[PDB]
Amino acid sequence: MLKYIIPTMMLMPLTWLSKNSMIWINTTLHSLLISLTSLLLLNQFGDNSLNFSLTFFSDSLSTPLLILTMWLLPLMLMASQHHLSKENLARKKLFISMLILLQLFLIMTFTATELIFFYIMFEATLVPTLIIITRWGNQTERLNAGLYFLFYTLAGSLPLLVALIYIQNTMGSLNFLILQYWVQPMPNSWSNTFMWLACMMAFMVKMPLYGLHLWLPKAHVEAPIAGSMVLAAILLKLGGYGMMRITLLLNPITDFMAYPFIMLSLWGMIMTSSICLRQTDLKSLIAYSSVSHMALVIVAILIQTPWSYMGATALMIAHGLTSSMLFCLANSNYERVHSRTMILARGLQTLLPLMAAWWLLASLTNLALPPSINLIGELFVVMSTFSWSNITIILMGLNMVITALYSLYMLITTQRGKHTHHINNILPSFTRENALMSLHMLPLLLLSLNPKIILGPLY
């Protein structure tokens, strides 16, 4: 895993010694080279995972997340170079360094075999994200959003540290392979109940769970575009990955202890979806859609069946790609019209036809159109939850309506109808925005051809 950490940490001299006019070109070129290099993690075996040393390993669950992260960094570099065009050079280099540090922390978080190292860099991912949100956010409410995000995460995740140190003192090790071969059942006691709660609540907050999701429609809105990409495409999936890793040790208490939380998502993904029917804000609409999809992921993890696990992996990857693309489209509209409200700019298909095509395709992939991997993940979670209980299909099917009921709604008021008369600064679409949309979307449709590389470690 040293072959990816070292070039990522050498990206900082690359971005700090470059000229004032070629930082973007050099950083995008070398991050695309690292994304190409990332494909050597597909050497997965049907029985054994890929173990590199005592410190790092990568099974078939971490590999799609690593490839997605190192593919996502150049996309952020291309997106965040227009609202920072007038910025000072030193602050531009500091922003690029924050992005590089965030990628380095993420790609060594996804590969740590030891759990306290995973916790340490899982919380080291807080600092660059928070700095980006509270520094390069636009309006006044970025400070409150940063406070909410940081304090929800830390107040949920300090008992996780306490529980992990207790595990290290009790079992004797925190290596994931040793814990895979030394796992003991957890009996029925109040101590084990709070053990389960301390292990679960950090990832509950970072998923987010309904009722603990109040930091999402702030931090996903006040942040800049690259902050929106990392907020919607990696960190939520990082919480899901941690949940998948740590649910191994919490058997068989989970078989009843997951009983409330499933309801807190099974109803929750209804309510937040209904919020998208009556949202006056485009970015808030995308954030609440992310809440609903990740609640579906929560249910899939908590019922702990194989089909649900592969559905959760495919759903996480597909939702990350789709949410990043939707945030890019909303940011392009916000750059053109200088307001975030959805009803201000209407009828943009008459002026911007190809961006309307990208909008249509992104909305179609949002509402789980087959044979996309969004539909594959949603379908597999549906099969597993039907095996769990029958009436759950109702809670699925109604959601299958409401999702489309906002997605096409998001397609209409932003693209269809009569255009706004007084808005006359609708410039034609740049090559950069179209290239960003294509680089977001074409990997998703190509992954629809060969989905078996994202179907989890038990495929």
Binding site: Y259, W267, T305, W307, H422
Partner: protein
Amino acid sequence: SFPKYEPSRLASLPTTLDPAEYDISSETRKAQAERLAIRSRLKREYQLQYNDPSRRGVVEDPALIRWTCARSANVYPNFRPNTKTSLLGALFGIGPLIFWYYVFKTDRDRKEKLIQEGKLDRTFNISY
């Protein structure tokens, strides 16, 4: 004779059947004159700053910003916890959660009881 038309929430009264339209008092004339004056002022401002050949951009609307700030950022400071808000929050917040928890717990308890007694048909069920 003819059936009288009554209003509803989803079917309002027609304008022509409204008695208040036929009231020709001078106070109604003053009210309509003031409303027309307000509308003419706003229209004149909008089409004065809208027909400008120099301006390129968005003619911003204070009413839209007012509506968005009222809909999103003004809900909490104007909220006071009383009996109505607390009863509505408890009725619509933890009601469906308890209902669905009881439904799913009952169904899965019955299913587990049937499964462990060898009663439920699970012949070809090998994918779960």
